[PDB]
Structure formats: C-alpha cells, structure tokens
Design a protein around this nucleic acid. Sequence first.
RNA 1: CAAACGUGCUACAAUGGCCAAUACAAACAGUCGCCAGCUUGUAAAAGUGAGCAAAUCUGUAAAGUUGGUCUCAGUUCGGAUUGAGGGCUGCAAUUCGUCCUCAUGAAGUCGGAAUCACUAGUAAUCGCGAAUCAGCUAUGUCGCGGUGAAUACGUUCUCG
Lengths: 44, 65, 175, 118, 84
Amino acid sequence: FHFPSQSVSFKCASCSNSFTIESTLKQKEITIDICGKCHPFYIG
Amino acid sequence: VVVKGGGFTGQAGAIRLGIVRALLQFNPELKKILKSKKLTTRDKRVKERKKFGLYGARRAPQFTK
Amino acid sequence: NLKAHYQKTIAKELQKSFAFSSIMQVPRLEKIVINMGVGDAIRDSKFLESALNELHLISGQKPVATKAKNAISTYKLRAGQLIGCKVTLRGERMWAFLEKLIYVALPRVRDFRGLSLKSFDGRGNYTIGIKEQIIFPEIVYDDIKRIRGFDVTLVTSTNKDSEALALLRALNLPL
Amino acid sequence: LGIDIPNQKRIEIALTYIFGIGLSRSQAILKQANINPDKRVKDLTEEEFVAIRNVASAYKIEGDLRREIALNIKHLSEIGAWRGLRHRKNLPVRGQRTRTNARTRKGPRKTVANKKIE
Amino acid sequence: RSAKKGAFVDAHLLKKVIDMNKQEKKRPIKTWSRRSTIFPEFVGNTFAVHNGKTFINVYVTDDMVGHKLGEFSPTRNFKQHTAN
RNA sequence: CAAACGUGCUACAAUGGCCAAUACAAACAGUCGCCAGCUUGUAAAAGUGAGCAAAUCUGUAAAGUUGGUCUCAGUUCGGAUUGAGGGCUGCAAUUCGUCCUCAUGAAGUCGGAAUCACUAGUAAUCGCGAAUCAGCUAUGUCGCGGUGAAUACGUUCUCG
C-alpha cells in the first residue's frame, strides 16, 4: 500500500513566485525561510 | 536623629546609645531598668588592627608540612 | 508538474543547441534512486523506522531495505541483516522529488556553497550528497542514532557529460 | 541561519545560540529588527524573519567567519613568523605562563615521572 | 597606524632601504633590528637578523607587511623532550 | 617545557546573573599628580578647560535596598586558550604591557586518601586606599572601613 501525497500550496514565503509542489497532505500552506528564486547564492 | 559616617547597623547602634543616654538624663529612675535588662553602653566592639604577614585579623595563610 | 513545462520549452531549445534535428535524441530523465547506506544499525538502534517513515512520507511508495552483498569480518555482518533503503522514482515523482530538493532543500541548508566539478560516472550521472537530516519540509522529530545524509543520484540517457551538464543547467541546479 | 531555534525563551536569548553572535551584537541586531521583545516570545510572524536575514547578511554569518579565520590562521602559519610556528605545535601564542600551566591545549591530563633521588 | 607612535619604527634602517631601492635590488644587504616594522618597500632583500648566536639570514615573503621584523626571527630552540 | 609539588584569585549559580534607580565609610595620596565639569568617543580613552602646595578641591563606595528578569540545562553560572579592529603608556609593545569592542563559551556539579586559619566585627567576607612606575593579568604586598556569624563538655586518646 502507498500513502497518498498531494499538492501543497507554495506561492509567497520570501519572494512572490514559486511552483506548486506536492508534500505531506496533513497540512497546507506552510512557510519556509528562503526558496530558490530569492536565494542570494543562487544569483549574484 | 542625625548621624555622620558608618554603616546602617553602626548608625543604628549610635542612635541606640543616643536614645538611651537622652532617656537616662531625662529621668534618673530609667537607670534602674538599664541595669535590669543589662542592655547598656558600648561593648567596645570595633574592628581590630590587622597585622603584617596576616591576610586578615586572625588569619595565617596556611602551614605546610 | 514540470513535465508539461519540460515539453513546453526545454526540449526545443535542447534540440536547437546541439545540431541533431531530433526531438528525442536530447538527454532525458529516467529514474532517481534513494539509498540510505545504513552502517550504524549493528546493535539495538532505531533500526531505520525513523528513516523508513521519513522516506515514505517524502515519497509515498514503500521503501525497501537491502542486505549485505558479502560478509564483512569487522562487524557481525554475514550476508543478511537488511540495511539502508531502495527507492526508485519515475512518473510524476521525478518532478515531485526534483522541485522539492532544488527549491526546498538546497536553500534550506545551514550553509551551502555548491560543488560541481566531477560527480559523474564518465557517462553523465550526477550524485548529490545530502548533509543534514532536516532538508525536507516534513520530518519526524525522532532522532536517528547518527545524523546523516541521503544517497541520491540523477541518471541520464546519453553517455556523455557535456549534454547532461547542459540539461542540468537548463534545470538550474547550482554549480 | 534560519534554523529552528529552541522555543520557550525570550528573543534576546533566542538570538544567542546562533554561532558568531553573542549577547551585545544580538541586542543591536534585535533593536535593528525592532521586534519589541517581550517575555518568552519566539514566533509571531515572518516579516520579522526577512529583516533578520537581511541584517544578518549585512554582517558576516558563522560560515564565512569560519572560512576567513581559517584562511587567516593558514596565512600566518604558512609564512615566517613565530605565531604560525607556535600554532603549528599546539601551544598558546599571545603570551602566557608556559612553565607548568597551559593545559587547555596541552592534552587533557597526561604526566611522566621525573628523575628519582635518594 | 594611530599617528601617535602606536606603530612606531626607528626609521633609521629605512635609509639603507632607500639606498638599495635604486641600485637594481642586489640581494646582499646587512640589516638586523628587532625594533623595525616592515613595509612593502622592504620585500625583495635579505635580513641578517640577530637571534642571539649569529646573524641568521631570512627573506620576508611578499604576502604581508603588517607585523614586525623581530617577530619573524626565531630564537628559542625546540624542546626535544627528554623524559628522564 | 613532556611534568609535580605548592601559595592564591576566580568558577561549579537561582544564599545568583542581567536590566535600571537607589543609599550607607574611613584612612591615606595628590602640582607636568588628583583631574571637576563639558565636546565627545559604543566605551576604552582622547580633547577642552576650573579647582586643589590641599579638614575648601579631586579621588565617583561595594555588598545593601525597589521593580522586573531568567525556573534547574553542564545553561543565560563560569570563563581561558583562540581572530580581527582600535586605545594608553613609554624613543620601544614578537618574545615581553595592559584596556576596550565584537566574537571564543570549552572543561567544570562541590573535588580521593590527608590537611590549614581562627573564641566576635573573629573567621566568612565587600568594595576601596597606598610604597611601585610612564605603563604593567601583582588574581600581589601594608591597611581602611561596610554586613555579619557558629561553637567552646573535658583533656583518655592526637600533636607540640
């Protein structure tokens, strides 16, 4: 048996853009400190 | 009561003696109760002069053997 | 997920970059393997159920452990006593894992400066070294006996490194 | 940075466990953030967090400090200088009593017999 | 420097440095004083610094000028532990 | 400097730290020294510039008190080795000065057989003064004063 994991919202945590990726479905709209598109090491 | 110098407990003892002396001169029979309770003037209880070679007043560093 | 975006843009510019005029000779993604490489579960440790549940949560499919391929005489390991985990990834779960890692784990590292000089087999398959337990948004707060990383690797169709690196750059993995 | 700090404490002490930042600089960075610290508050919002990251990046985080100090020690040790030679033998450099009291780097506790008399 | 002799140098060895800074930088020059702090103009020569037994010849590298000349001259011997 | 004896300071903390306000001393020293106040400087400390040949003035008391404050972690107690930036001193700060700022926050829970001080402002202690210089981890040494105990049955044993 496989436990279902469905999309979790991720649109604004430190910037204004992100892609909706699936995670644990027991919670929705969780915030993270920094993502890829606003990472100072990512671009600079 | 007006004091000059000394710690609060020392000032307390000073005003103790002042109060008792003024009471005694106020009325002689007060003397009697001063002998009844034996709470009386100074017990000459003051910091003794510490000596050379002693870190305190009665303290030697320690004796090695 | 991004497979629609992959076919939307990346495939055509990959075709245009290298002169081949074929829509499928460009490198493609096949599978991602997750291995745990357990070397601490010799005595009554947490025996991977912490790892089992965290890996099953990050990937809903059942993780499968593996036994020793030989008998190592420096421990009590003799062809058995299953260790580690084996998770093969394909379908929607390519992107499910890839975006989670690239945009949720790498910036989440305590300190990350990137490292990509030669991590290939000489045929274009890139290994990724996880550092800490907490790089996933979800994690069970039970402590593994030894805090460790995870073994993950990306495989490519082409046996060449330049095209695989170009595809990874198109996917924007930090170098 | 960005690690989940231990809960159940004031913000002032909350900004101490991070490496590189002690007490006074934690106070200055907190005042720059203007969190208005209260008793045993740990998480209230995220708009404070972004300011904290910005001001921390204005200063130098633990990782870069460790790299720069390691590089400085390497430079002072790979050039002709008594400080580098001293650090290479694992002895204090700044000048202390080196006779019999240096046991912070000179092994936890090890000893050898002296010559015997009589 | 604090301009209040917080990084003072006797500056009387520097006269020989100015002398040798115009003669195509020939290697041999006699120089020994623990009182002197080095500057970028010094690099490219030898110092016969006095440890206490003989004028040991040293060449300061071209990576830094911050510290003093006397710091770069080892004098104390190695312990060579002898546990009796 | 591979080590051990020592003689001490300072810790193992909620018989407290930290944040602020707030008292209570004496004795001694002081004309290129005490430095008042002020410009300041994160503060070190620089500068400006009174007074003091001194019962006029300068040496700012500290423990204590009022409110919080942290709630039993090897921590916020504790701090040294360690890096950088500065300050004073002295013509000189690597050996081989000390001060400040940011960091560094380990080890250490009352320390084994054995041992030392003391019958009252005495031990416990709390901050200051001074011979020493230009300066000096002297955590010394000669003192000042602040709070303030406990115990003393008798010399069999123990030592002199």
